[PDB]
Amino acid sequence: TQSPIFLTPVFKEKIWGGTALRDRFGYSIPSESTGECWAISAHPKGPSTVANGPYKGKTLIELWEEHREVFGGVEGDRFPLLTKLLDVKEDTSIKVHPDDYYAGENEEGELGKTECWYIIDCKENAEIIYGHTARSKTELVTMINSGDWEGLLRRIKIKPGDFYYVPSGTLHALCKGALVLETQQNSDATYRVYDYDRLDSNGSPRELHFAKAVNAATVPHVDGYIDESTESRKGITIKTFVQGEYFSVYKWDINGEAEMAQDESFLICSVIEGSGLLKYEDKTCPLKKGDHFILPAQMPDFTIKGTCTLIVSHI
Ligand SMILES: [Zn+2]
């Protein structure tokens, strides 16, 4: 296809969620404790539906299975990624995501969940939990059992604009006061080790997966290294956050009119700030904060005019 494919958001309630998705993006949310917006999703538990054009109403799964041409004919049983907006009002659980092998073996073919975080906004003293100090799996087990979160967990102070890559196997948790654009593999495989003994809307504690978390966790933890790059042309500054095995993620900072080309299999796009006008051939497409869309394989060269910021990804 040759035109933008907009996606209608799906929402998920979370004990750590809030109303920021409605307050900052104008979204109609399910509850006053909404933690996640599954923005570009083909996950069975909450797939995005096409919001416009000839495919309006179809799910991203139906597009992947029946119209792979849209995605440049790339291989794979399922659309590979999942993009979310996260309203981390309170702390999320301490957890680890398995890799493709472990997930497939223990979660019935589910993909692993390597992911990354772009911090859109956050409070002044915001942090994240990333990595740990255990030198062996027996030590990790011991320190988790004595709830020595202070000696075990490693914390990183964050600020708006930060980017963190989270390889599967990484013990982590986003903490209270953060608004995040999370790009991850198409998976919902999560092993929690601690959830602060909280109760959900139904008065029941959330599930923990101690054994699986320890099995999936990388020990010892070693901080990986990613090199960012930035380049600018007329009307746009592009920051390249990562070009990894599972995805490449970028930030487009537009001011004025930028000339673009879609030279990948497809581009996943989220407008996180401002508004603008996308023009291609004789067509016009208004863009605004909160829009999520895919630019197909055959998308014609286009321009975006305005003051807006998008986070974009591709495989
Ligand atoms: Zn996570």
Swiss-Prot record:
EC number of this enzyme: 5.3.1.8
Disulfide bridge partners, by residue number: none
Cofactor note (record): Binds 1 zinc ion per subunit.
Keywords assigned by UniProt, alphabetized: Carbohydrate metabolism, Isomerase, Metal-binding, Zinc
Pfam families the UniProt entry points to: MPI_cupin_dom (PF21621), PMI_typeI_cat (PF20511)
Gene Ontology biological process terms, A to Z: carbohydrate metabolic process
Record keyword Secreted present: no
Reactions mediated catalytically: D-mannose 6-phosphate = D-fructose 6-phosphate
Active site: 192
InterPro entries given in the database record: Carb_Metab_Reg_Kinase/Isom, Man6P_Isoase-1, Man6P_isomerase_Firm_short, MPI_cupin_dom, PMI_typeI_cat, RmlC-like_jellyroll, RmlC_Cupin_sf
GO MF term (any one): zinc ion binding
Record family assignment: Belongs to the mannose-6-phosphate isomerase type 1 family.
PANTHER family per UniProt: FRUCTOKINASE, TRANSCRIPTIONAL REPRESSOR MPRA
UniProt cross-references to NCBIfam families, sorted A to Z: manA
Name this polypeptide is given: Putative mannose-6-phosphate isomerase YvyI
